Design a protein around this nucleic acid. Structure first.
Ligand SMILES: [Mg+2]
Ligand SMILES: [Zn+2]
Ligand SMILES: [Zn+2]
Lengths: 203, 874, 99, 135, 100
DNA sequence: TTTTTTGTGGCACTGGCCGTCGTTTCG
DNA sequence: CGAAACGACGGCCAGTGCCA
């Protein structure tokens, strides 16, 4: 719940203060509101995996050091594999950071839709925000149709066993178990109700 | 009405005597003719029955209880009882203390069982016949002690229970007649006229020759004797409360006092004479003290003090009274009384019962006899009464052969003369009344029953001489036993828990500034520290943290009651206060204003955060800062932007002890660490009469002597009628009302006011000053050598060692000797030897502690120095 | 407090809505402004004594002067403690998919 | 931080100087450096506290950094740091005193007004006049 | 001496292991003790992390507790009371030699 | 426990200190 | 016609004077 409260601020800060194109935050305020948060390295659009694509291993390490200074043992290496050749580049070197510092890896898929058959349903939803025809071209597209809620068995197809192992899969269930976020509701849930002030001063 | 009284007795006996009166034992009694069912069944019947069944065994407790109920029912007072314990058992249930009982009331086993009385009357020598005389129909007068705070609540209960129109409190000089008329204040000669009787009426009053001196006095004395009988006006009685059956308006006329309490127009004797039920609700302070004793002990160490289940033979409790530590021990605080207990060395409760009873002008002569018999250095003989011995011994062994209590004489009369214990009560009445020749009925009556029992009529008459002698000063055991229990409870809390006992004393009398100052210095000289208040650790009132007494937040002067609570409540929901900034940003000026903040710093409650001079300068700056932080937070925001964390504390040079302790006096009411006087200890040594030791030292000296005394001035007056300024000199041992009358000579001419030390020559009889000297007048005046030798030094060596080492260093310094003897600090100025101010250091080389103290003999005159030149160095 | 504030600072408050008008206390203090005992208005429908449920008091204001009354609450209780609630089709879905 | 509270104005500005462990005024600092040390440690122990700062990168953790070299001050005492003193004046005193501490009182003194007293009462004049009285 | 100890006054006792939850005392224990009054004190041998402490709470006093008290890591002995072994009254030293 | 020459209690009224209401004036 | 600011005030807490 302390983490949930920090997420409530970080989200509120991003809109109220750091809003330009999207609602953005800082590593400075993340440092302030990192209490009770678990961090993952992120998708290809993230800080470390983008620095790796620029052939800049020196900046991604120091950026990993900056996040490792904030979250400590609450930081993790996010390893997600779709069809992308850029993920080969990234995941290979991410593995080295994971093995050097001893951070532990967590597997994910970055799903935007439920099943694989939604691929076109999602793709047309992109064309509605982009306001273009099915064959524009140059329309807001996603690189594939692999962005869905995959089966545990189906994850191994993307992440081979004699290469990754079981640590990405097992950590996924361990972190899910340890995320004990109970919002105050049910037999819980107290009333945050104000007093008012006072007369003068009486009951 | 009589049956429900029996139920409550049978129910009561079970809980008061667990090991003896059990469910099993009650069933048995039913068989010779749920626990509550048995008491119910025993009530039903019936006198004829109970009668047939006709140390303290299980059968004896019943017979006693059964006999008292028989008397109470027959005389027609079961209803009177049921009313009494109702409001007492209500008081217990609603958090109001009830005493063990006063008067004869404690003698009844029924009263004890049910819950009016809370002392075992059959364990001690208490009698029901003393309480209610079975052979005479007279209403018993039950008086009950309560906590002085919660006394009105128990009267308020009665007013709602028995009706507002049927319940109300009862309504209530020669010297004044001469003065009070003249007053409508100075006299000055009018007091010398009324000092002739310090009062008995002028009807009698042999210095009446003053009348015929002046014609003014002729009338005034004749007029004053005519206005004596008036009883002043009307007012409320402390304990008096009446509960009539029918509305009071029908018989007794009423009033309402200034506090709105309903008051009877008749007095006690007039209300009783009409035959109305009267009750005395007394307000005791010991019960109030014992309430705070239980809460602090439970708060400190998690112990539930059950006063009614304490062991009566605790070794630490008695050996504490044996050491004369009766500082706050109930019924035992008097000077001579304290000395009497240390000599006596009490070991059982009966020693305190006898001591308290004997200690008063009259039976006090028997105390020394009691102490030697008690300590085991004088045989207890009854050789004067050999035949009567067997009856006297079991009665008098408890008190070592001394007829102390009234119950003993009743027992001695009942057993030896064969009287009924009811009519042995009547015999006590006759001996007190001293009826000319009526007690000669009791003499011959005693002799007849005496010789039928065995006494040969030579002893019988002389035995009666003994009784009538001790009957004059015979005290009531029931009352003494009950009140002695509260003394023992008081002593018990002190012995085992001395810190919280001292903190209780401070808590009870927290408003009186003189007592607090006394209680602190008693605690400081007992190994128990007494710290100032603290926002982090102190509670509302006095508190015991670990083994240290700690001042409350309420004790701070300018800090509000709401503020005291608000500060405390903020700390609980949040954390402990981390800094000054954290304090005043969490607690706005709204609640804790600047006036209260300043007084909190002066008191020392914010000492954890830093220096007081620095904190006092940092107030307004941080108040602006704290005001600005809210304005930011009251507009979205979050933290880093909303707060530039508290600046460094606004620098300031530290306070000197004079002004620091002066602020402490303003913050709380009295100084923190005793002092200041002893900061310059050169003068403390001189002290010819310490404030405490003044009475002890001055009385054994010539008629109205003179003596020099130092301390600190704490009062401002000047003149005129002249120069008549009343200042108060205060020491670490106390203070005195010093005049400031002789100064109009003129003149001592102080102009010193508060916060400066002085030395004062004064005459004593009250004290009357004559000459005065400030600190620099003392320090400049020619000094003298003073050695402080211990008792340990033999005379037939012969003490030539001290004389040899003083010979080698001649000069011109008087040598003083402080001999700490077995009892009293002696003062000894030397003889011929005058030191030359080199022998100080060369003497400290050996095992002696020398000083360069101011010469006492010099303090006089107004030249040579002089007083002008003694103001120059200051 | 804010209803009495509204009246004094030129903001017309409505006589009440929902079950709020049922309470005499509400009427007396001035939340609602219609005599509940004159008409057949009952307290027990507003607050059921035999059930601890928080009563929801809705108040009608002038549509011009409504933002002022909210502003009063923002200033009074704290800017960080006062905010308005957020509010998030079959035909629309068909057409957009048709495009 | 208990010392940092005792702060009697300019009192602790010298206190931070006197029992030191600094580095010749200390680069980028500050005084005290013993304010940071317990922030690094995080009292009492406490495992999830002294790791924090070492992982980003009481006394041994403080010695583990650190701006040591210099070596200035020691105690806690040490120093640095018509009648009158006199004679002249050093100290050590050359007329009165001391069986010091008294020494220390003559070094903070100079100069050059007499009396006063300040702080305030009240024996520096007396000991002076008494010292002149023995020619 | 031993011969005194074995014949001396026998105060009640309950030995308690360091393993102790907050929701076990002091209501359940004091209730069992209050129901049986007597003239002997009670003690608490707390076998702690380092060293054997003794918290002799208060007059509480009954020989049925043993059965319910061993239903746990705690045991009840009738030892010669540690908090005594001082003073020179009440007993005393003579009346400790008498029953031997 | 009651009487005396005394102290202390407990309550009531005044006064000094921080946020409130009303009128008035200007935008 | 509404807001702002000054001016007069109100309420509470604390001390201090004498009541059983
Ligand atoms: Mg009475
Ligand atoms: Zn992404
Ligand atoms: Zn994503």
């Amino acid at each position: 719940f302390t983490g949930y409260q920090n997420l409530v601020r970080l989200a509120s800060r991003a809109y109220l203060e750091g809003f330009y194109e999207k609602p953005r935050i800082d590593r400075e305020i993340l440092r302030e509101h990192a209490q009770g948060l678990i961090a993952l390295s992120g998708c290809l659009g993230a800080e470390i995996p983008q620095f790796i694509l620029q052939d800049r291993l020196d900046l991604a390490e120091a950026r990993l050091n900056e996040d490792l200074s904030i979250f400590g043992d609450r930081f993790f290496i996010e390893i997600q594999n779709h069809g992308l050749p850029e993920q080969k580049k990234v995941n290979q070197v991410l593995k080295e950071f994971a093995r050097k510092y001893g951070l532990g890896m967590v597997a994910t898929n970055d799903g935007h839709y439920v099943r694989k058959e939604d691929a076109r349903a999602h793709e047309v939803l992109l064309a509605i925000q982009s306001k273009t025809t099915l064959d524009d071209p140059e329309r807001w597209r996603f690189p594939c149709d692999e962005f869905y809620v995959k089966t545990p068995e189906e994850m191994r197809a993307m992440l081979p066993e004699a290469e990754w192992g079981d640590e990405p899969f097992d950590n996924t269930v361990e972190i899910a178990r340890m995320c004990d976020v109970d919002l105050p509701i049910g037999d819980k849930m107290v009333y945050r109700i104000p007093r008012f002030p006072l007369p003068e001063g009486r009951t | 009405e009589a049956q429900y009284l029996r139920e409550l007795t049978f129910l009561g006996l079970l809980r008061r005597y667990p090991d003896r009166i059990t469910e099993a034992f009650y069933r048995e009694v039913l068989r010779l003719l749920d626990e509550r069912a048995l008491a119910e069944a025993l009530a039903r019947v019936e006198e004829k029955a109970w009668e047939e069944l006709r140390e303290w065994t299980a059968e004896a407790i019943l017979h006693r209880a059964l006999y008292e109920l028989s008397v109470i029912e027959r005389m027609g007072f079961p209803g009177y009882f049921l009313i009494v314990q109702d409001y007492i058992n209500w008081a217990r249930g609603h958090g109001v203390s009830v005493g063990p009982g006063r008067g004869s009331a404690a003698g009844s086993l029924v009263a004890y069982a049910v819950g009016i009385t809370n002392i075992d009357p059959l364990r001690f020598g208490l009698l029901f016949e003393r309480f209610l005389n079975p052979e005479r129909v007279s209403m018993p007068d039950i008086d009950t002690d309560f906590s002085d705070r919660e006394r009105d609540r128990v009267i308020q209960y009665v007013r709602e229970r028995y009706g507002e129109d049927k319940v109300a409190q009862i309504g209530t000089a020669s010297k004044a007649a001469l003065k009070d008329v003249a007053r409508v204040i100075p006299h000055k000669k009018a007091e010398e006229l009324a000092k002739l009787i310090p009062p008995k009426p002028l009807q009698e009053a042999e210095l009446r020759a003053e009348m015929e001196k002046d014609e003014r006095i002729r009338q005034v004395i004749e007029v004053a004797m005519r206005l004596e009988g008036l009883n002043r006006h009307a007012s409320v009685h402390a304990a008096g409360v009446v509960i009539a059956a029918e509305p009071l308006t029908d018989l007794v006329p009423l009033m309402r006092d200034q506090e709105g309490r309903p008051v009877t127009q008749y007095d006690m004797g007039a209300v009783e004479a009409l035959g109305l039920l009267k009750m005395d609700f007394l307000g005791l302070r010991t019960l109030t003290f014992l309430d705070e004793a239980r809460r602090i002990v439970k708060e400190s160490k998690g112990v539930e003090l059950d006063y009614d289940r304490l062991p009566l033979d605790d070794p630490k409790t008695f050996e504490l009274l044996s050491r004369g530590e009766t500082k706050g021990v109930f019924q035992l605080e008097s000077g001579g009384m304290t000395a009497t207990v240390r000599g006596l060395k009490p070991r059982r409760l009966e020693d305190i019962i006898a001591l308290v009873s004997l200690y008063r002008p009259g039976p006090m002569e028997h105390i020394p006899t009691y102490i030697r018999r008690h300590h085991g250095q004088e045989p207890v003989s009854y050789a004067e009464f050999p035949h009567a011995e067997k009856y006297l011994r079991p009665i008098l062994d408890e008190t070592y052969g001394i007829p102390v209590y009234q119950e003993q004489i009743m027992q001695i009369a009942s057993q030896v003369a064969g009287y009924s214990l009811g009519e042995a009560d009547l015999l006590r009445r006759a001996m007190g009344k001293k009826r000319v020749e009526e007690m000669q009925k009791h003499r011959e009556r005693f002799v007849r029953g005496a010789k039928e029992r065995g006494v040969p009529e030579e002893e019988a008459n002389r035995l009666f001489d003994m009784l009538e002698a001790f009957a004059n000063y015979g005290f009531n055991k029931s009352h003494a036993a009950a009140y002695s229990l509260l003394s023992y409870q008081t002593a018990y809390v002190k012995a085992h828990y001395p810190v919280e006992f001292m903190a209780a004393l401070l808590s009870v009398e927290r408003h009186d500034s003189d007592k607090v100052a006394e209680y602190i210095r008693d605690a400081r000289a007992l190994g128990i520290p007494v710290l100032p208040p603290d926002v982090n650790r102190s509670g509302f009132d006095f508190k015991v943290v670990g083994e240290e007494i700690l001042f409350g937040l309420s004790a701070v002067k300018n800090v509000g009651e709401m503020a005291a609570r608000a500060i405390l409540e903020e700390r609980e929901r949040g954390g402990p206060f981390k800094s000054l900034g954290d304090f005043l940003k969490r607690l706005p000026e709204q609640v804790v204003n600047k006036r209260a903040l300043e007084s909190l710093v002066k008191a020392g409650a914010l000492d954890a955060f830093g220096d007081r001079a620095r904190l006092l300068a940092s107030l307004e700056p941080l108040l602006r800062w704290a005001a600005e932080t809210r304005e930011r937070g009251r507009s979205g925001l979050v933290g880093l932007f909303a707060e530039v964390e508290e600046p460094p504390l606004v620098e300031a040079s530290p306070l000197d002890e004079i002004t620091m302790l002066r602020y402490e006096k303003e913050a709380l009411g009295i100084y923190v660490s005793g002092h200041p006087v002893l900061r310059y200890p050169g003068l403390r040594e001189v002290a010819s009469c310490t404030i405490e030791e003044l009475s002890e030292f001055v009385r054994e000296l010539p008629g109205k002597p003179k003596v020099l005394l130092s301390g600190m001035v704490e009062e401002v007056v000047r003149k005129p009628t002249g120069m008549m300024a009343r200042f108060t000199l205060s020491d670490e041992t106390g203070a005195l009302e010093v005049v400031v009358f002789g100064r109009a000579y003129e003149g001592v001419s102080p102009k010193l006011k508060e916060d400066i030390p002085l030395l004062v020559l004064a005459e004593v009889e009250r004290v009357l000053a004559q000459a005065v000297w400030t600190l620099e007048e003392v320090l400049e005046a020619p000094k003298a050598l003073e050695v402080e030798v211990d008792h340990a030094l033999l005379d037939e060596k012969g003490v030539a060692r001290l004389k040899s080492l003083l010979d080698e260093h001649p000069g011109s310094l008087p040598v003083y000797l402080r001999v700490l003897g077995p009892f009293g600090e002696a003062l000894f100025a030397l003889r011929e030897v005058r030191v030359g101010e080199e022998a100080l250091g060369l003497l400290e080389a050996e095992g002696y502690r020398a000083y360069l103290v101011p010469d006492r003999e010099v303090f006089l005159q107004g030249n040579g120095g002089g007083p002008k030149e003694e103001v120059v160095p200051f | 407090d804010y209803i009495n504030w509204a009246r004094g600072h030129g903001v017309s408050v409505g006589p009440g809505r929902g079950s709020a008008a049922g309470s005499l206390v509400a009427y007396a203090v001035g939340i609602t402004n219609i005599d509940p005992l004159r008409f057949g208005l009952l307290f027990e429908r507003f607050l059921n004594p035999e059930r601890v449920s928080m009563p929801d008091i809705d108040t009608d204001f002038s549509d011009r002067e409504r933002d002022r009354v909210i502003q009063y609450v923002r200033e009074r209780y704290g800017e960080d403690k006062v905010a308005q609630i957020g509010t998030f089709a079959s035909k629309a879905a068909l057409k957009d998919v048709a495009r | 931080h208990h010392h940092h509270h005792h702060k009697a104005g300019e009192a602790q500005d010298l206190a931070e100087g006197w029992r030191a462990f600094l580095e010749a005024l200390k680069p980028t600092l500050r005084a005290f450096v013993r304010e940071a040390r317990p922030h690094l440690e995080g009292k009492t122990l406490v495992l999830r506290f002294p790791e924090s700062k070492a992982f980003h990168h009481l006394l041994p953790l403080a010695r583990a950094q650190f701006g040591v070299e210099e070596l200035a001050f020691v105690l806690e005492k040490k120093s640095l740091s018509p009648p009158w003193e006199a004679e002249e004046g050093e100290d050590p005193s050359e007329e009165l005193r001391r069986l010091a501490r008294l020494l220390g009182g003559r070094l903070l003194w100079v100069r050059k007004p007499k009396a006063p007293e300040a702080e305030e009462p009240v024996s520096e004049d007396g000991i002076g006049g008494n010292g002149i009285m023995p020619p």
